[PDB]
Amino acid sequence: GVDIDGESDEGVKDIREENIYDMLATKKFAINVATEAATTVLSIDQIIMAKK
Amino acid sequence: PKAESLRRDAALKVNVTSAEGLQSVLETNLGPKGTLKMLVDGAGNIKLTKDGKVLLTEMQIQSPTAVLIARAAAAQDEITGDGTTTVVCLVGELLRQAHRFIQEGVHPRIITDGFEIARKESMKFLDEFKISKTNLSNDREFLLQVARSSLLTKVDADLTEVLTPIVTDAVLSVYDAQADNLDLHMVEIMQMQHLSPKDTTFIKGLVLDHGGRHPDMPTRVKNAYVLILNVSLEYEKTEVNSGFFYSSADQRDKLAASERKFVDAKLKKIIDLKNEVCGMDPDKGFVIINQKGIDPMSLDVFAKHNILALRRAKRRNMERLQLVTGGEAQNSVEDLSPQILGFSGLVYQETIGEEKFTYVTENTDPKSCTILIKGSTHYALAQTKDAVRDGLRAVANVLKDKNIIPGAGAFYIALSRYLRSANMNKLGAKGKTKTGIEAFAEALLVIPKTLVKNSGFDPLDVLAMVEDELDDAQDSDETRYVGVDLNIGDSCDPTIEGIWDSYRVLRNAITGATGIASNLLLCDELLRAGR
């Protein structure tokens, strides 16, 4: 993974040593939300509002 | 000494120019490759709709020219229900094609009269181009591809496969096979948040708002009798004015229980009906509707007998339950009869803390349907509902009218080719009529060019491949329909792909857009009066 460093010498280390991982239910469900969030923005080519 | 020929041209040009701005806005969202427009009032109202008529109602236009454009779709949504954006594209583009002819000195009457002549000739070619479809119920497999025409337009095509069986099975289930008609008012649409739009499923019965809350209620009840209960089970009082006089708190329960005996006396006759007919028989259930409220004492009584308790039902939804279940409304408990009980299938209630729905589904003759659209966000509820209401009204004219027309610009390209070669052979109208027919033929070719423009493919290449294919089909002595394929970019067979449009939708689209666009060029001057 991406090591914070600030210690030891150089390089990275196994993330499984600290028992840190992302649950599949969190990652898999976040992909469907991230695609639909950017789809709405790219699909809107015009906006109309009023002064408030 | 003032006599002016300067009245030739006037704000009519601005009337055409104002229509050009509305065209460029509604040109991008036309078709399944279009864009999803978003309008915000500023008070928290956010609606995302690709339909043109829906958006124009929330936007005020000072230009009177665009007012008649929005009013022209009033008859389209109430009859055809589809193609509101296509009609607007035909009105705006026809003004641009006629702009070059006005500057050359062509009088607008010949331009106006030339459109009515081409409109009457288009109706003669429309009867030969249409295809009559049988009323047999074996066409459901063919109706699946036809229903996708309205579905693929308003969504990203990922939810089309989910809503395809729901829309198809909704109309055909309640419709016996005959001429008759179909009624979309019997289909109710409800919404609930905190769920994904991919969970949308078909509902055969009616969905109820307030469900029963108790841990011991049975989850699944198969073959249960529905009984309408019109009496209030809440706390009741003596029929005459009185009061509660108690010296101690123990004496209050004696006077309070005296008024509660009226409710408990009617509950003894209700529980006896369950054990009277199929009491100990397996796969049996007894469900109480009870539109009115429920007292907390009956919660433990109905739980021991596995009786579903419901309260606070909508008055409009009760009229449909009498048709689906068949049980008559029972006002008095003493008059309750065993024949009042109806028929129902397996009833399962989903457990959710926010709301609980009761499924009336799985009936012999429900004669009703419910389309449940659920989504987490606000725009997911409005966008999907727009595709369902447009899909039901598009198929509505498919079952009523036996004629069907291929879509994807099949009729727009073919009609422009027929009217082009037929004008030189007839020559029975006038020599100046060619300006109106050529402008009307070129105004119909914008629809196939608009669909391909949003896809990114060159509109010049698709126009040449279709015209070259139609010339080879005439010399081969056969009938082959050609259409625009947006995914690949080449031509396609509309019969194999399954793109089809109703006859009444395109009939009023060409006729409606012709009269409205012709009346725009008839305006001599724009007058401001009344203030």
PDB file of C-alpha atoms in Angstrom, chain B residues 16-184:
ATOM      1  CA  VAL B  16     -37.853  33.456 -36.128  1.00  0.00           C
ATOM      2  CA  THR B  17     -34.649  34.400 -34.293  1.00  0.00           C
ATOM      3  CA  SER B  18     -36.315  33.802 -30.919  1.00  0.00           C
ATOM      4  CA  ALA B  19     -37.333  30.350 -32.167  1.00  0.00           C
ATOM      5  CA  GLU B  20     -33.731  29.644 -33.194  1.00  0.00           C
ATOM      6  CA  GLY B  21     -32.578  30.057 -29.596  1.00  0.00           C
ATOM      7  CA  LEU B  22     -35.188  27.588 -28.357  1.00  0.00           C
ATOM      8  CA  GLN B  23     -34.170  25.116 -31.076  1.00  0.00           C
ATOM      9  CA  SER B  24     -30.500  25.030 -30.054  1.00  0.00           C
ATOM     10  CA  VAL B  25     -31.525  24.293 -26.458  1.00  0.00           C
ATOM     11  CA  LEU B  26     -33.864  21.412 -27.338  1.00  0.00           C
ATOM     12  CA  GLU B  27     -31.642  20.055 -30.127  1.00  0.00           C
ATOM     13  CA  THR B  28     -29.117  18.521 -27.719  1.00  0.00           C
ATOM     14  CA  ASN B  29     -31.569  16.502 -25.592  1.00  0.00           C
ATOM     15  CA  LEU B  30     -33.513  14.921 -28.477  1.00  0.00           C
ATOM     16  CA  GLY B  31     -33.349  11.137 -28.664  1.00  0.00           C
ATOM     17  CA  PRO B  32     -31.746   8.434 -26.524  1.00  0.00           C
ATOM     18  CA  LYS B  33     -28.326  10.037 -27.099  1.00  0.00           C
ATOM     19  CA  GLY B  34     -29.564  13.377 -25.764  1.00  0.00           C
ATOM     20  CA  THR B  35     -28.784  15.161 -22.519  1.00  0.00           C
ATOM     21  CA  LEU B  36     -30.637  15.428 -19.209  1.00  0.00           C
ATOM     22  CA  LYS B  37     -31.644  19.018 -18.469  1.00  0.00           C
ATOM     23  CA  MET B  38     -31.865  20.362 -14.916  1.00  0.00           C
ATOM     24  CA  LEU B  39     -33.875  23.362 -13.705  1.00  0.00           C
ATOM     25  CA  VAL B  40     -33.656  24.957 -10.253  1.00  0.00           C
ATOM     26  CA  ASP B  41     -36.125  27.490  -8.862  1.00  0.00           C
ATOM     27  CA  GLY B  42     -33.935  28.364  -5.859  1.00  0.00           C
ATOM     28  CA  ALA B  43     -36.416  27.322  -3.154  1.00  0.00           C
ATOM     29  CA  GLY B  44     -35.170  23.720  -3.145  1.00  0.00           C
ATOM     30  CA  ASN B  45     -37.121  22.376  -6.138  1.00  0.00           C
ATOM     31  CA  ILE B  46     -34.829  20.326  -8.396  1.00  0.00           C
ATOM     32  CA  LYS B  47     -36.281  18.308 -11.284  1.00  0.00           C
ATOM     33  CA  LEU B  48     -34.319  16.523 -14.021  1.00  0.00           C
ATOM     34  CA  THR B  49     -36.447  15.868 -17.111  1.00  0.00           C
ATOM     35  CA  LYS B  50     -35.570  15.384 -20.783  1.00  0.00           C
ATOM     36  CA  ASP B  51     -39.128  16.109 -21.954  1.00  0.00           C
ATOM     37  CA  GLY B  52     -39.662  19.499 -23.562  1.00  0.00           C
ATOM     38  CA  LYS B  53     -43.239  20.101 -22.437  1.00  0.00           C
ATOM     39  CA  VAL B  54     -42.437  19.385 -18.780  1.00  0.00           C
ATOM     40  CA  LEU B  55     -39.591  21.917 -18.712  1.00  0.00           C
ATOM     41  CA  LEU B  56     -41.442  24.742 -20.490  1.00  0.00           C
ATOM     42  CA  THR B  57     -44.163  24.779 -17.815  1.00  0.00           C
ATOM     43  CA  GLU B  58     -41.602  25.790 -15.166  1.00  0.00           C
ATOM     44  CA  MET B  59     -39.989  28.505 -17.331  1.00  0.00           C
ATOM     45  CA  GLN B  60     -41.692  31.777 -18.253  1.00  0.00           C
ATOM     46  CA  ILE B  61     -40.859  33.153 -21.710  1.00  0.00           C
ATOM     47  CA  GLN B  62     -41.501  36.822 -22.452  1.00  0.00           C
ATOM     48  CA  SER B  63     -41.327  36.239 -26.216  1.00  0.00           C
ATOM     49  CA  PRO B  64     -44.874  35.464 -27.447  1.00  0.00           C
ATOM     50  CA  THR B  65     -43.488  33.341 -30.302  1.00  0.00           C
ATOM     51  CA  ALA B  66     -42.253  30.591 -27.969  1.00  0.00           C
ATOM     52  CA  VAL B  67     -45.584  30.651 -26.101  1.00  0.00           C
ATOM     53  CA  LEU B  68     -47.468  28.923 -28.927  1.00  0.00           C
ATOM     54  CA  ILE B  69     -44.667  26.343 -29.165  1.00  0.00           C
ATOM     55  CA  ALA B  70     -45.308  25.230 -25.581  1.00  0.00           C
ATOM     56  CA  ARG B  71     -49.076  25.356 -26.158  1.00  0.00           C
ATOM     57  CA  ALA B  72     -48.774  23.181 -29.277  1.00  0.00           C
ATOM     58  CA  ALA B  73     -47.628  20.267 -27.094  1.00  0.00           C
ATOM     59  CA  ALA B  74     -50.771  20.524 -24.939  1.00  0.00           C
ATOM     60  CA  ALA B  75     -52.714  18.389 -27.422  1.00  0.00           C
ATOM     61  CA  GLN B  76     -49.723  16.074 -27.928  1.00  0.00           C
ATOM     62  CA  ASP B  77     -49.330  14.994 -24.294  1.00  0.00           C
ATOM     63  CA  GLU B  78     -53.084  14.516 -23.800  1.00  0.00           C
ATOM     64  CA  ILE B  79     -53.422  12.363 -26.946  1.00  0.00           C
ATOM     65  CA  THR B  80     -50.092  11.087 -28.268  1.00  0.00           C
ATOM     66  CA  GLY B  81     -48.098  11.486 -25.050  1.00  0.00           C
ATOM     67  CA  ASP B  82     -44.766  11.172 -26.876  1.00  0.00           C
ATOM     68  CA  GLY B  83     -42.676  13.216 -29.281  1.00  0.00           C
ATOM     69  CA  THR B  84     -43.085  16.663 -27.719  1.00  0.00           C
ATOM     70  CA  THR B  85     -39.427  17.503 -28.387  1.00  0.00           C
ATOM     71  CA  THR B  86     -39.559  16.216 -31.974  1.00  0.00           C
ATOM     72  CA  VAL B  87     -42.478  18.524 -32.808  1.00  0.00           C
ATOM     73  CA  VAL B  88     -40.538  21.543 -31.528  1.00  0.00           C
ATOM     74  CA  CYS B  89     -37.508  20.594 -33.634  1.00  0.00           C
ATOM     75  CA  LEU B  90     -39.719  20.497 -36.739  1.00  0.00           C
ATOM     76  CA  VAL B  91     -41.153  23.958 -36.028  1.00  0.00           C
ATOM     77  CA  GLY B  92     -37.812  25.663 -35.412  1.00  0.00           C
ATOM     78  CA  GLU B  93     -35.875  24.057 -38.264  1.00  0.00           C
ATOM     79  CA  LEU B  94     -38.657  24.828 -40.755  1.00  0.00           C
ATOM     80  CA  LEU B  95     -38.274  28.532 -39.940  1.00  0.00           C
ATOM     81  CA  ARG B  96     -34.528  28.437 -40.642  1.00  0.00           C
ATOM     82  CA  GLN B  97     -35.002  26.718 -44.009  1.00  0.00           C
ATOM     83  CA  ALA B  98     -37.617  29.333 -44.954  1.00  0.00           C
ATOM     84  CA  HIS B  99     -35.403  32.226 -43.807  1.00  0.00           C
ATOM     85  CA  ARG B 100     -33.342  32.094 -47.009  1.00  0.00           C
ATOM     86  CA  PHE B 101     -36.504  32.097 -49.142  1.00  0.00           C
ATOM     87  CA  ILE B 102     -37.999  35.160 -47.426  1.00  0.00           C
ATOM     88  CA  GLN B 103     -34.919  37.277 -48.176  1.00  0.00           C
ATOM     89  CA  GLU B 104     -35.188  36.319 -51.866  1.00  0.00           C
ATOM     90  CA  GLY B 105     -38.656  37.892 -52.088  1.00  0.00           C
ATOM     91  CA  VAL B 106     -40.867  34.800 -51.799  1.00  0.00           C
ATOM     92  CA  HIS B 107     -44.262  35.674 -50.356  1.00  0.00           C
ATOM     93  CA  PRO B 108     -45.047  33.813 -47.102  1.00  0.00           C
ATOM     94  CA  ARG B 109     -48.511  32.726 -48.287  1.00  0.00           C
ATOM     95  CA  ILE B 110     -47.041  30.432 -50.951  1.00  0.00           C
ATOM     96  CA  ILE B 111     -44.657  29.193 -48.255  1.00  0.00           C
ATOM     97  CA  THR B 112     -47.637  28.654 -45.942  1.00  0.00           C
ATOM     98  CA  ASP B 113     -49.938  27.169 -48.591  1.00  0.00           C
ATOM     99  CA  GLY B 114     -47.089  24.989 -49.860  1.00  0.00           C
ATOM    100  CA  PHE B 115     -46.842  23.311 -46.455  1.00  0.00           C
ATOM    101  CA  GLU B 116     -50.539  22.402 -46.370  1.00  0.00           C
ATOM    102  CA  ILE B 117     -50.295  20.835 -49.836  1.00  0.00           C
ATOM    103  CA  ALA B 118     -47.272  18.753 -48.819  1.00  0.00           C
ATOM    104  CA  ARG B 119     -49.043  17.806 -45.579  1.00  0.00           C
ATOM    105  CA  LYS B 120     -52.045  16.374 -47.436  1.00  0.00           C
ATOM    106  CA  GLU B 121     -49.746  14.488 -49.819  1.00  0.00           C
ATOM    107  CA  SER B 122     -47.788  13.120 -46.851  1.00  0.00           C
ATOM    108  CA  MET B 123     -50.953  11.524 -45.450  1.00  0.00           C
ATOM    109  CA  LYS B 124     -51.409   9.526 -48.663  1.00  0.00           C
ATOM    110  CA  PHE B 125     -47.852   8.172 -48.445  1.00  0.00           C
ATOM    111  CA  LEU B 126     -48.330   7.548 -44.710  1.00  0.00           C
ATOM    112  CA  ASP B 127     -51.055   4.929 -45.213  1.00  0.00           C
ATOM    113  CA  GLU B 128     -48.813   2.892 -47.527  1.00  0.00           C
ATOM    114  CA  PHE B 129     -45.764   3.172 -45.251  1.00  0.00           C
ATOM    115  CA  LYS B 130     -47.519   1.995 -42.079  1.00  0.00           C
ATOM    116  CA  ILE B 131     -47.697  -1.683 -41.112  1.00  0.00           C
ATOM    117  CA  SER B 132     -50.832  -3.217 -39.608  1.00  0.00           C
ATOM    118  CA  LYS B 133     -50.159  -5.392 -36.555  1.00  0.00           C
ATOM    119  CA  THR B 134     -52.592  -8.021 -35.304  1.00  0.00           C
ATOM    120  CA  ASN B 135     -54.371  -7.726 -31.956  1.00  0.00           C
ATOM    121  CA  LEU B 136     -53.345 -11.245 -30.888  1.00  0.00           C
ATOM    122  CA  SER B 137     -51.708 -11.573 -27.470  1.00  0.00           C
ATOM    123  CA  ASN B 138     -48.702 -13.459 -28.897  1.00  0.00           C
ATOM    124  CA  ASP B 139     -47.082 -10.125 -29.857  1.00  0.00           C
ATOM    125  CA  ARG B 140     -45.804  -9.536 -26.301  1.00  0.00           C
ATOM    126  CA  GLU B 141     -42.372 -10.694 -27.476  1.00  0.00           C
ATOM    127  CA  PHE B 142     -42.552  -8.035 -30.199  1.00  0.00           C
ATOM    128  CA  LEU B 143     -43.863  -5.401 -27.770  1.00  0.00           C
ATOM    129  CA  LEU B 144     -40.702  -5.715 -25.657  1.00  0.00           C
ATOM    130  CA  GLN B 145     -38.520  -4.057 -28.303  1.00  0.00           C
ATOM    131  CA  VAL B 146     -41.223  -1.475 -29.056  1.00  0.00           C
ATOM    132  CA  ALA B 147     -41.454  -0.378 -25.413  1.00  0.00           C
ATOM    133  CA  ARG B 148     -37.678   0.177 -25.318  1.00  0.00           C
ATOM    134  CA  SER B 149     -38.022   3.143 -27.696  1.00  0.00           C
ATOM    135  CA  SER B 150     -39.519   5.347 -24.976  1.00  0.00           C
ATOM    136  CA  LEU B 151     -37.409   3.807 -22.194  1.00  0.00           C
ATOM    137  CA  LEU B 152     -33.945   4.242 -23.732  1.00  0.00           C
ATOM    138  CA  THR B 153     -34.605   7.967 -24.236  1.00  0.00           C
ATOM    139  CA  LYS B 154     -35.060   9.120 -20.630  1.00  0.00           C
ATOM    140  CA  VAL B 155     -32.440   6.895 -18.937  1.00  0.00           C
ATOM    141  CA  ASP B 156     -28.843   5.764 -19.461  1.00  0.00           C
ATOM    142  CA  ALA B 157     -30.067   2.340 -20.767  1.00  0.00           C
ATOM    143  CA  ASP B 158     -28.787   0.564 -17.625  1.00  0.00           C
ATOM    144  CA  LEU B 159     -32.242   0.595 -15.992  1.00  0.00           C
ATOM    145  CA  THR B 160     -34.122  -0.229 -19.212  1.00  0.00           C
ATOM    146  CA  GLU B 161     -33.816  -4.004 -18.774  1.00  0.00           C
ATOM    147  CA  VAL B 162     -35.236  -3.685 -15.251  1.00  0.00           C
ATOM    148  CA  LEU B 163     -38.255  -1.579 -16.257  1.00  0.00           C
ATOM    149  CA  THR B 164     -38.942  -3.573 -19.441  1.00  0.00           C
ATOM    150  CA  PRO B 165     -40.940  -6.460 -17.862  1.00  0.00           C
ATOM    151  CA  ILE B 166     -42.693  -4.107 -15.421  1.00  0.00           C
ATOM    152  CA  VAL B 167     -44.177  -1.816 -18.078  1.00  0.00           C
ATOM    153  CA  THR B 168     -45.096  -4.725 -20.360  1.00  0.00           C
ATOM    154  CA  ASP B 169     -46.805  -6.858 -17.699  1.00  0.00           C
ATOM    155  CA  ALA B 170     -48.674  -3.859 -16.247  1.00  0.00           C
ATOM    156  CA  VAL B 171     -51.015  -3.183 -19.173  1.00  0.00           C
ATOM    157  CA  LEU B 172     -51.433  -6.745 -20.465  1.00  0.00           C
ATOM    158  CA  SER B 173     -52.411  -8.186 -17.069  1.00  0.00           C
ATOM    159  CA  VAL B 174     -55.497  -5.982 -16.605  1.00  0.00           C
ATOM    160  CA  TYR B 175     -56.466  -5.920 -20.307  1.00  0.00           C
ATOM    161  CA  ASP B 176     -58.691  -8.639 -21.732  1.00  0.00           C
ATOM    162  CA  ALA B 177     -58.318  -9.317 -25.449  1.00  0.00           C
ATOM    163  CA  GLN B 178     -60.776  -7.234 -27.502  1.00  0.00           C
ATOM    164  CA  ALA B 179     -60.975  -3.752 -29.002  1.00  0.00           C
ATOM    165  CA  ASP B 180     -62.016  -2.023 -25.748  1.00  0.00           C
ATOM    166  CA  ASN B 181     -59.393   0.398 -24.354  1.00  0.00           C
ATOM    167  CA  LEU B 182     -56.831   0.703 -21.561  1.00  0.00           C
ATOM    168  CA  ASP B 183     -56.951   2.880 -18.439  1.00  0.00           C
ATOM    169  CA  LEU B 184     -53.719   4.142 -16.876  1.00  0.00           C
TER     170      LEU B 184
END
